[PDB]
Symmetry: D2
Subunit: 422 residues, 4 copies
């Protein structure tokens, strides 16, 4: 029964052609949905009650579009998101962190615009987790956004939006200085011929996967759902293909900001992503990601590859990792394990930000501290196992891989352990 | 000999990559497609695309197959659509650079227990009006195909039957349906209502994979450019869907309401043409050929053996084309199954095989009508030179190019066994 | 270049010219062969063990000390010739030569003692002489038995029974010497600790032109099963009378290593020849060159693809540790082992990194020479009060011995493999450590 | 039939990994293909008798080596005459006649820097006596090959030069030496004294790999079956060395003292023959072909393009043979570089090309003696039929086998461009 579910017959195929031939509509997904959903907040999704339904449907990142609305309007959206998120904090073993992303207006006809400087300052003051920087054309555009965030916004992630020909041509220099990328297909499809956008999307997703940096696929994914309860055949195909391409995140714009079916649009992206994730050909994907990642002397990079390899060997249900900044979980995520990466962190911001990395399931640790560091570490590892059992990630008899470090503080991950559940 | 400019076009840097990940990383929006568009476009005929003048514009935009939807309209209405298609096609019979065969496909209303009474009458109409293909609605099992085949009566055995898979049973009984069909249509409209909408992509990719493995045509259909029914430009998801159907391995892509009733039928055909050319150059032939080769069983059929030899030879020299002589279209279909980058120029005397080979990706049919030569070897050489001269006129070939030529040792279908490497003079 | 550029700037271009590293990074086996370089010097310690047959030419304590220094890891006693009194004196001389180096625990070399049986002869089962010789082996504490003419699983069960209750820890290496042994290979391997491709009798029992097929098949199947395989007979035959071997002989040694043999053997070359020490040095020199010429990239991928999924934490930790070692060009994998099993599971994935096995068992230290790339360290210190501290002291002993022995340098990365509780069978931890 | 798939290591051939390929090797799986690695036997007191030379030709000797390090010109001229008399004693049956090449192995430069005066005299003797090949001793750089070529003069332009790599400089300057040579000999005797003995296998495997990549012949030589000089059976290391030279990719294997002076010259040839057939069936063609294919550059030469198409076609149908018509041996050499499992039966009118193609693995030369037919197409067909009849008589072919036929579009060298699938009747 186990080997009939989650496209396991297709997973064992010897060629990609055979893998396609073995895909089965009756093979049900079992793993948790790995690709994060970004939902744009607007009139259709602003109320606290509506936001609670969207969190339950699978929204992981709330996008604030600073192209429209005042600072007062966006501050109320942030407060409503935080109120809806915290209404589930009463059960810490099931609570879902939700990131807040600020999408800038852009340069317009101009460097960094004066409105963007003000909006970025607003973001730092209101504690946003991510910035989606509009119309990034070169590395100096990213440096200007980084400078406008100041010393208090040092921890905010910058996702550069590639929306034009220059951004595509200067992609490598932009990615090098960014935390990740957004394939902003709306403007990109107007700036370059519409029939070429898929080449830019697939190239950028491939290069981000190679670099181990988050990549977002965005715009018109479920467009018809703005007025209709069900999407078109092209729309479900687009969502599935963005996941199969290797996108870490998928996005909804008008579908959630102004449409008549915001909750249904989130549920549809969730349903398709789970199906597409099981249809991934991990055998080739892992081998290629492994070969293309360079040799390293960083113990976190060395432990990550060892843990992902160990997970595939035993069909591990999860890789539990302790992380302060989210970096150890991100280095596991870059090899696209089938095993869920359960990230146990004390940082509420890192818990929100790791939604950018595919397959990272954040658990915010709020249990009392232990006097002995080693005892505290073990307690955090047991917390990950207990949340995993409660949420259905783990069952008795499963094997898990546990990733920890040799001393407190970030940057010291160097240990991988094989543990049998219960 | 070819130059660095040649190796920058048609995604050739991405083509030479050693991994699929590296292939994706090397895709270039500035690398322009050079080869002719190889995925055929099927356009549904209706009020928005019925006039002879509108049909001429759709033929120029790239329509290769005209679909008649027998779910609506009378026999008199469909006979007029067929006459208008044939008139528009024959208006270019004077200019060799623009004349192209256009297939006529009858899409049945559907079943009720066995084959419906209306389907028996419509299939008989199809034979009487000389349709090339039947898109059989709601095929659920092999006996449904046998019933459609029996309705093609005594005179319609040459008509191709493309089974439409529109429900759960059709997906589960896929292997037995494909075995007795000429090809398959992934009919996503009904399929997306019969099975959960989030599962349609799995059924599409599985069926395309299985058809590619079997070497049989597969059509991707429904809502590909849906928003173009009322808008002049499609959504980002729609262009992505067309590109991904081509990258999945679909031989044909289809337009329904977009060309039957929408406000932009010609623009919808142009958009599918533009995306297909881009997606075809982005195919990773290196792995696709290796996998088609490894999965395909050993063969002692000389046509199959010649086809793989010719496709291998074409990749070795970057051949501009493979010219094949075919009576039924079978030799061209066996070349097409290995997905060569080189265009497969099929020279045939059969007007029906010329229209029907549009079902096979990369097959460019040429209808030959010169009177037979007394010496068979001379008649063969005249047809080979006809394909070279048409290729030179249409942009496929130039003097100095290498072409692969596929022929047989004696007249009649079934004797293909020769592959020659020719330098264009 | 992008996959090695940063590590090349850090370790230097000189590092990446040695140990056939340009050939190691090749994308095809054809390109790997094209990049093999006679100027690319081996750096790693020799990982294929050398078995030397003891006889008149290699029996003295002084001669045995020179053979231990040349690289002999396993001493073979051929019970086809010589009395029990003769073999007991050979064992005592081996032990005296081995223990003459025990003064420095950080450099001491354990040497296994293997008893090679006379065989069944014309009989169907275990001969009466074999029953007596196997009982002699148990009484004299031999580590391994090379069982002659194994033809089926019941032959190994009979050898196991003759060893009795006291010889349960002795390893049984079944010698495949005839057609039936080749045909019944799978059932023989299943119940044996390992295999010996006994080419002398095999080359008489089957056509001489087919022996290479049997050798390559058996080595492949043992590599797949993760069990030791020995290549034996006439490897350096001409060295019995000549100081240098033939071109076919050096080729045969190199090819046995490239095939995947864990051990290579010398018979007459060391037992009766005029150059026993030079024969050991020649096998050592060739094995070092051939080990660096292994195409690890495909070998590791294929061992992974062919090996079934495992739910054993020692097995899962072993593959994780070998993967981690390849990622950082680790100088060594240090493993704590009671029976040698954790080191054997690391060894089955053929890491380029040396597997330094720290054990308290003197017998396990001798027996792990059967597994390619396992370097045994005998830990003589009594247990610490706190188990976690005792574990750390053994790891530090491995690091300090590794530094003094040239395996490790300051700045190197090492992979450390340990377990969660005392006793055999609980290995489940892998750590990445930087040498200070 | 199931019996077919149990022989010639076919279960191991179908394996998905090299590890699984090794695990499936079977000592009971008998070789079926003809032995494709050529045997070079050194001539001397033990192999000069015309009657003994006849036995060595029947045992499998393809190339007779004359070692000019020992013996006078008068002695070597007698060797040549005895070889030619033994070879020509079988010319009365053209369907079974086996050409045998004559190779002159030079004494070398000794302590000098360039071509020695004795080598200039021996090379002129070789041209005057019509030798086919020169094994040039101690080649250290490209200018050494140019000096050998100059000493052969205008009359020796057709002689093949095989450079012997015997020292450190020859290994370091390998690429420049191979570029100007026809092939290479891994001369292990001197190489094993010039460089550490434990490094010779690295040089042998590297040189064989580079020659396979270049598509140029490579010979493995010295002490392969050394103990057979005095003993009737070789050592386990000797049979292993022969098998491993074949598995490495050597086109030729050599016997020196074993045939020149030993007591078992005929048995030594039979032993190399027996091991080579076993080792050739144990080759993992699946990976070897893919790697030779990927490493070979794109080509616009029709002979090169036809060769890869024909090898691919041969694997698809399990062709028993590829019959090629060749004037210089080049078309057969280009087929040979892709290491087909199918025997390459080369039909030629050039007696010298027939002898020289033994340097290329898997090329079985047939000397056609009939004068040209009036109609060129008939002359081509007669040669193809001669290839089929010889192949049937020798056991290469049976009725029902598929064969790939490689020919050209016009007479003369350099025009191969046709590949034909033919059923043996
Ligand atoms: O285009 S192919 O060469 C091809 C496609 C996909 C894969 C395996 N894959 C893979 C490997 C990578 O390293 C990577 O970065 C992305 C993806 C990738 C990308 C996709 O767009 C997709 O639809 C599926 C995959 S995958 O299954 O995860 C391998 C090969 C191909 C396509 C169709 C065929 O029938 C065929 O034989 C081969
Ligand atoms: O060393 S390996 O990587 C290896 C060895 C051989 C091959 C396939 N092969 C191959 C491919 C080439 O392109 C080439 O030029 C030579 C040969 C080659 C060379 C040999 O020395 C040999 O004994 C066998 C082969 S082969 O089977 O034809 C592929 C891989 C290897 C060796 C042993 C293993 O158990 C294993 O899993 C992998
Ligand atoms: O992923 P990051 O940011 O590097 O954090 C990993 C760190 O977490 C730990 O496992 C636990 O550290 P803390 O006790 O400080 O939370 C460290 O040992 C390790 O260095
Ligand atoms: O693809 P098909 O239908 O088998 O037709 C291929 C046939 O065409 C030819 O090349 C030419 O035949 P005709 O001269 O009869 O057209 C045959 O030799 C070959 O058998
Ligand atoms: O390789 P083996 O025989 O399984 O031994 C590995 C064992 O060694 C240890 O690392 C140390 O155990 P001890 O304290 O008994 O020496 C265990 O944790 C582990 O189970
Ligand atoms: O291998 P080579 O030397 O290029 O010879 C191949 C030549 O042999 C042929 O098949 C037959 O030519 P001939 O009739 O002159 O012998 C030519 O068509 C072809 O060019
Ligand atoms: O801003 C965006 O998201 C776009 O243009 O697609
Ligand atoms: O009939 C069709 O084409 C469908 O249902 O998609
Ligand atoms: O017994 C042996 O060692 C042999 O036969 O090789
Ligand atoms: O000359 C040779 O053949 C050698 O030196 O090996
Ligand atoms: K914005
Ligand atoms: K219909
Ligand atoms: K014995
Ligand atoms: K000589
Ligand atoms: Mg935009
Ligand atoms: Mg329908
Ligand atoms: Mg024996
Ligand atoms: Mg010499």
């Amino acid at each position: 029964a186990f080997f009939q579910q989650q496209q396991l017959p297709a997973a064992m195929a010897d060629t990609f052609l055979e893998h396609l031939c073995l895909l089965d509509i009756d093979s049900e997904p079992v793993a948790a949905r790995s690709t994060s959903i970004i939902a744009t907040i607007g009139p259709a999704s602003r109320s606290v009650e509506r936001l609670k339904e969207m969190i339950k449907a699978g929204m992981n990142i709330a996008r604030l579009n600073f192209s429209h609305g005042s600072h007062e309007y966006h501050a109320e959206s942030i407060a409503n998101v935080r109120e809806a998120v915290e209404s589930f904090a009463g059960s810490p073993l099931s609570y879902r962190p939700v990131a807040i992303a600020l999408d800038t207006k852009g340069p317009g006809s101009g460097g960094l615009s004066e409105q963007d400087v003000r909006d970025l300052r607003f973001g730092v003051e209101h504690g946003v987790d991510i910035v989606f920087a509009s119309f990034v054309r070169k590395a100096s555009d990213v440096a200007a956004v980084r400078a406008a965030l100041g010393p208090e916004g040092h921890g905010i992630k910058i996702i550069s939006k590639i929306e034009n020909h220059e951004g595509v041509k200067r992609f490598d220099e932009i990615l090098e200085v960014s935390d990740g990328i957004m394939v902003a297909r709306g403007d990109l499809g107007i700036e370059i011929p519409a029939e070429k956008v898929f080449l830019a999307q697939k190239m950028m997703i491939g290069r981000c996967n190679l670099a181990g940096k988050p990549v977002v696929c965005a715009t018109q994914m479920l467009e018809s759902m703005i007025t209709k309860p069900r999407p078109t055949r092209a729309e479900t195909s687009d969502v599935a293909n963005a996941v199969l391409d290797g996108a870490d995140c998928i996005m909804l714009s008008g579908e959630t900001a102004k449409g008549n079916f915001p909750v249904e649009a989130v549920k549809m992206q969730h349903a398709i992503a789970r199906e597409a994730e099981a249809a991934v050909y991990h055998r080739q994907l892992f081998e290629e990601l492994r070969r293309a990642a360079p040799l390293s002397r960083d113990p976190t990079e060395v432990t990550a590859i060892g843990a992902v390899e160990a997970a595939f060997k035993c069909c591990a249900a999860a890789i539990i990792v302790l992380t302060t900044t989210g970096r150890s979980a991100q280095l596991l995520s870059r090899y696209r394990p089938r095993a869920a990466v359960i990230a146990v962190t004390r940082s509420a911001q890192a818990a929100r930000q790791v939604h950018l990395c595919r397959g990272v399931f954040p658990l915010l640790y709020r249990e009392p501290p232990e006097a002995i560091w080693a005892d505290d570490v073990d307690r955090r590892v047991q917390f990950g196992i207990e949340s995993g059992k409660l949420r259905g990630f783990l069952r008795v008899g499963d094997l898990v891989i546990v990733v920890t470090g040799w001393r407190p503080g970030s940057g010291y991950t160097n240990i991988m352990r094989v543990l049998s559940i219960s």
